[PDB]
Structures are given as structure tokens and as C-alpha cells.
């Protein structure tokens, strides 16, 4: 579980967030897209495996679990691609409480930013350093040292 | 120094390769940009700190030290903002140094992508996880879980 993250693809302003979560600790990495292309996962996936050691990648949907782009780049970055079918039901409720929560915060920030993109980067920073205490960023490093050791 | 990042611009096929390097551990991120703006250094490090805890940051030039955007994003996301001058004179060597290694490794993968920015992205994979035996990911890891208990 240390390396095991979660794709999440939303929507706002006609535009395409793009999340992967951390799934023991809930922090978050995120991009604006214009549209959830396999490139543009694929890309994404290779940006976050060089900063973090993953693992294992349950992909958002069939399309992004079907492409053969997303397919090569997990081959390239040494991730295990998996389906994201919530075998427990309360896991997608919890994704739909993020967006709802990520969305709050983007809402609570947008007047600063002229760009979608840097009230998402803010909103970001917000949810990773907000103590629940531990903050998400503080339990995603102290799960890996962990494990690391 | 579990906080200090230091930035670092440099340039490749007529772009420029903009890089924060942790100084305490050696791991990078990197991202590729038309030119070297305020705006984007300042969207650059809004993105690092929503990511890792960044309490220092060493600018790379005078002209991101002054900029008044630079400044807002540093005052927004509660980083320090500092020069970037070698007080020690094995430090620009070691970036110097760095620029190279990467523009190395980006050499060995540059075929396998169509945009510079794919192969900038495999050199920071590369790069972070490369065993030296830890690696810079393993080590920045273990200095921040470290530095919170
Ligand atoms: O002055 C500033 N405060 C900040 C605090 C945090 C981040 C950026 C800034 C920033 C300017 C800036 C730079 C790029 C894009 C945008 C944008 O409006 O999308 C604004
Ligand atoms: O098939 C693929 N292997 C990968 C391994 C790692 C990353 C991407 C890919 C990838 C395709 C892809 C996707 C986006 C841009 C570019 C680009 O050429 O810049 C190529």
C-alpha cells in the first residue's frame, strides 16, 4: 500500500482536472487538461512516478486502463496497471468527496488566480498541508520512510 | 535543510528546462517552458511546495530574485526566497555538474519521445531513482520523514 495510487478525473469550467491520489494517505497530485487523452495520462503517470515510487495505478476508467499509450508508459515507469472497480463501495464515495472538497477549495481561491490551472496547483497545496494531526504530506513521507526502511 | 530547494535554469533545443533541486538529497523536479518568466518560476514553485515542505528556496538569477510575481508566490505558499550565490564555490560546480548529467540522460532517452518535455520527464524518473547505496528519492524521503518526528 505504500506505492498504491488512485487515477481521478474531473471537470470544471469546460476544462479536465486530472488526479492521482495517494490512497493510504490522501495527498494529491493534480494538472489541468483540456481533455483526458491516453497522451495526456500517460504523460502525467511518468511525471508522478518520477517523484514518487509507485507501484501500483488503478486507473479512472476503461479507456485510460485500454490505451496502449497508458499501457507503455507504465511499462516505461515500472507501474502495475489495475482496473479502479471500487471492491469496497465506500472508495468511490470517497473520491466523490474529494472532487466536492477539492472543488470547495478551488471556489475558495478562484478570485486570486486569473488561470484555472494555478487555483488548482493552490487548491493542491491547500489539501496536502491541512492537518486532519497529521497533514496528507506529512503521512504520504512517513509511510514510504517506513517502508523504505 | 530539510526545506532548502535550490533553482536552476537551462536550456535545450531552444527551450528552456527550468529545475529544483533539493540540495540535502539531489532529487529534481523539472518542467519544460518556451522562456524563463516571473510567471511562470512562480507557478513553478507554487507547484513544488503544494508537493514536497519547501521553507528556503536559493533563486537562480537576479531577475527571479526581483520579480514582483515570483515574490507573491513565494509569500503565498510561505517560502523564503533567497539569492542563489555560492557562498561555497563547489556549489554552481555541483549544478553545473547536474546540467550536464542531465542533459545526458536526456540524450539516452531523446528518441524514444516526440516532445522534449517526455524526455525531460524520463531524465527526472532516471535522475531521482538512480541507486549511488540509496537514491535521491529514498533520501529526500528519509530526510523530511526524519525532520518531522
Ligand atoms: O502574483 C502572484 N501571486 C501568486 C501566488 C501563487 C502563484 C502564482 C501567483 C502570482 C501570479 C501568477 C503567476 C502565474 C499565473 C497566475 C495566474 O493568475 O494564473 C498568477
Ligand atoms: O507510448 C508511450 N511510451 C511512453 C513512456 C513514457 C511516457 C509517455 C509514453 C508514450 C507516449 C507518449 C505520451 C505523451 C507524449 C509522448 C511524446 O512522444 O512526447 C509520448
Same mark, same amino acid.
Given at each position: 500500500?505504500?506505492? @498504491?495510487? +488512485?487515477?481521478?478525473?474531473? %471537470?470544471?469550467?469546460?476544462?479536465? /482536472?486530472?488526479?492521482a ?15 483526458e ?21 488503478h ?18 515507469? =515500472?507501474?502495475? +496497471?489495475?482496473? =479502479?472497480?471500487?471492491?469496497?463501495? +465506500?472508495?468511490? =464515495?470517497?473520491?466523490?468527496?474529494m ?5 470547495? @477549495? /478551488? ?7 486569473? %488561470? ?20 496528507? =504530506?506529512?503521512?504520504?513521507?512517513? /509511510? @514510504? ?5
Open positions: 500500500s505504500p506505492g @498504491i495510487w +488512485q487515477l481521478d478525473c474531473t %471537470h470544471l469550467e469546460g476544462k479536465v /482536472i486530472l488526479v491520489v495517494h490512497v493510504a494517505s490522501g495527498y494529491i497530485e493534480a494538472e489541468v487538461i483540456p481533455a487523452t491516453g497522451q495526456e495520462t500517460a504523460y502525467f503517470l511518468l511525471k508522478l512516478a518520477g517523484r514518487w515510487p509507485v507501484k501500483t495505478v486507473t479512472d476508467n476503461g479507456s485510460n486502463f485500454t490505451s496502449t499509450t497508458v499501457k507503455a508508459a507504465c511499462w516505461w515507469a =515500472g507501474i502495475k +496497471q489495475e482496473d =479502479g472497480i471500487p471492491y469496497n463501495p +465506500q472508495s468511490q =464515495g470517497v473520491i466523490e468527496s472532487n466536492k472538497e477539492l472543488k470547495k @477549495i /478551488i471556489g475558495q481561491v478562484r478570485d486570486q488566480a486569473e %488561470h484555472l490551472k494555478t487555483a488548482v496547483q493552490m487548491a493542491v497545496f491547500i489539501h496536502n498541508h491541512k492537518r486532519k494531526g497529521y497533514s496528507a =504530506g506529512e503521512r504520504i513521507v512517513d /509511510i @514510504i520512510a517506513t517502508d523504505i526502511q
